[PDB]
C-alpha cells in the first residue's frame, strides 16, 4: 500500500507491466492486467475503475493522478524494465496531435514489461503512464486519466 512504483508480475514468473501506488490507489494500464485482481503480499487489490479507450485501470479507489505535461519542459520516464533496477530516463516529449487536442508523447522504446511505468515532471508528479503508442520506432503517448 506504500506509495511508489511497482512491478506487475504473473505466474516461473514474468513481469507483464508496472504501476503507481498513490493515495492508496494502484494505477496501471488496462492492457497490462485487463482489470484482473492483483495480489500484494497476503492482501488483494480489487479493480475500481477502468477504460479500454484510455487504456487505464485503477484499484482500490478512483484514479488519483492529475498532473499534466506543461508542453515545454523535459520530463523523466521512471522506467522499471524486467530484471533491472528502476531508472530515470530524461527526454523532451514530442506531441500526438489529435482531433480532440494534443497529447505529449515520448520517443522511448523499452521492453513491453515496462508498460505502466510513470512519466514525471520536474516536481516529481506523475503526468501519465508509458506504454500505449504508435510506430513511426515506437513512440508512447503520455497517458493520463481523470481525477
Amino acid at each position: 500500500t506504500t506509495d511508489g512504483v511497482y512491478r506487475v508480475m504473473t505466474r516461473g514468473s514474468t513481469q507483464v507491466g508496472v504501476g503507481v501506488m498513490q493515495e492508496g490507489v494502484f494505477h496501471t494500464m488496462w492492457h497490462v492486467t485487463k482489470g484482473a485482481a492483483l495480489r500484494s503480499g497476503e492482501g488483494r487489490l480489487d479493480p475500481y475503475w477502468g477504460d479500454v479507450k484510455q487504456d487505464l485501470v485503477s484499484y482500490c479507489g478512483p484514479w488519483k493522478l492529475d498532473a499534466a505535461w506543461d508542453g515545454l519542459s523535459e520530463v523523466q520516464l521512471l522506467a522499471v524494465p524486467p530484471g533491472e533496477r528502476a531508472k530515470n530516463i530524461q527526454t523532451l516529449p514530442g506531441i500526438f496531435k489529435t482531433k480532440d487536442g494534443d497529447i505529449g508523447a515520448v520517443a522511448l522504446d523499452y521492453p513491453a514489461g515496462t508498460s505502466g511505468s510513470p512519466i514525471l515532471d520536474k516536481s516529481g508528479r506523475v503526468i501519465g503512464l508509458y506504454g500505449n503508442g504508435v510506430v513511426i520506432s515506437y513512440v508512447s503517448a503520455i497517458t493520463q486519466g481523470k481525477r
Binding site: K53, A107, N132, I136
Partner: protein, 40 residues
C-alpha cells in the same frame, strides 16, 4: 493465473538521469479500442 505486485522504488526525479530521445510531432487518431494510428 495469479498476478501480483512488488515495490520497485520511490517516485522521484533524478538529477543524474540519462538523457535521450527525440520529440516527434505526429498526427494521430485514437479508436474505440484504445489504439493509436497515424493520420495523414
Amino acid at each position: 493465473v495469479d498476478m501480483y505486485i512488488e515495490r520497485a522504488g520511490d517516485i522521484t526525479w533524478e538529477k543524474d538521469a540519462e538523457v535521450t530521445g527525440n520529440s516527434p510531432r505526429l498526427d494521430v487518431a485514437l479508436d474505440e479500442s484504445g489504439d493509436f494510428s497515424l493520420v495523414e
